[PDB]
């Protein structure tokens, strides 16, 4: 990675491989020009310890470091634990077509719908709007449609009301504890910059309104819209899966 300062603060792996190749080339040269009897041994010990620093740093006695106290990262520190490929990149991923803001009340909602801003609904639902523009014939190519929805002209709000209409979104509170923590709503466009969320539903999220933040996701494909309508809709989950108590208790 460049740090935009003329220098490369390198990753730890290139440092480790560079140490192994330095020590290995010096050992090839020392086996070339003959080792002094009981001498071709210290260099092989150094090579073994450099490879043991590369494959799993810190498992052998005291680990190495580049700067300054922190031990640098080997391969087994990229597979294991947190900050590794199993728990940070493969089981939970960062996801396109998503957004997040601060929640609020708005009690004029039916319980299968939530308020969602015009700016968030215009930025989540971009390629739907592109498809409706070149399907109705208001832009020739994709670039004219992109510049139309960047300027936000007076026709794309009608396009946006024609793409929101029967299309669920997934609302998500950030500590998801049980399976009612992800639910699916049908959006209503709001002038403003917050997510208006039905009050009874906030019994299931354990969410007050003292600064809580919720994240919305969009189901792209068709089967995911049917799963966010038949399986995950806010009217269906009125009973908890822990017991038979209703979860729509008026608070």
């Amino acid at each position: 990675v460049p740090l935009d300062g003329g220098r490369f603060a390198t990753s730890d792996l290139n440092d480790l491989y560079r140490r192994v190749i330095n020590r290995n080339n010096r050992l090839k040269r020392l086996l070339d020009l003959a080792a002094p009897d009981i001498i071709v041994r210290n260099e092989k010990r150094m090579l073994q310890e450099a490879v043991d620093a590369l494959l799993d740093n810190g498992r052998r006695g005291r680990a190495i470091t580049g700067s300054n106290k922190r031990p640098l990262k080997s391969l087994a520190d990229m597979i294991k634990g947190k900050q590794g490929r199993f728990r940070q990149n493969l089981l939970g991923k960062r996801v396109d077509y998503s957004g997040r803001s601060v929640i609020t009340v708005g009690p004029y909602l039916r319980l299968h719908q939530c308020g969602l801003p015009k700016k968030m609904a215009l930025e989540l639902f971009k390629p739907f709007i592109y498809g409706k523009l070149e399907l109705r014939g208001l832009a020739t190519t994709i670039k004219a449609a992109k510049k139309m929805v960047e300027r936000e002209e007076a026709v794309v709000w009608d396009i946006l009301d024609e793409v929101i209409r029967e299309h669920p979104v997934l609302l998500n509170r950030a500590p998801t504890l049980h399976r009612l923590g992800i639910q699916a709503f049908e959006p209503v466009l709001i002038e403003g910059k917050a997510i208006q969320l039905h009050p009874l539903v906030c019994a299931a999220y354990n969410a007050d309104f003292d600064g809580d933040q919720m994240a919305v996701h969009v189901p792209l494909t068709l089967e995911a819209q049917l799963e966010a309508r038949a399986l995950m809709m806010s009217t269906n989950n009125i009973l908890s899966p822990a017991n038979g108590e209703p979860i729509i208790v008026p608070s």
Binding site: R29, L33, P36, D37, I38, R41
Partner: protein, 54 residues
Amino acid sequence: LFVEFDPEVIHTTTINATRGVSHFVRFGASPAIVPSAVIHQLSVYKPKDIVDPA
């Protein structure tokens, strides 16, 4: 590098402040008593070449 000195009375950390110090030939925890094969039975050499490595 081959150096002649005496271990106990002159303790090493005093002499540490200088070069000549990475550490002993060991093959083990203790500083291994090295042979001087070149000094004893292999004095004059390098007929390998003067390849001037690479």
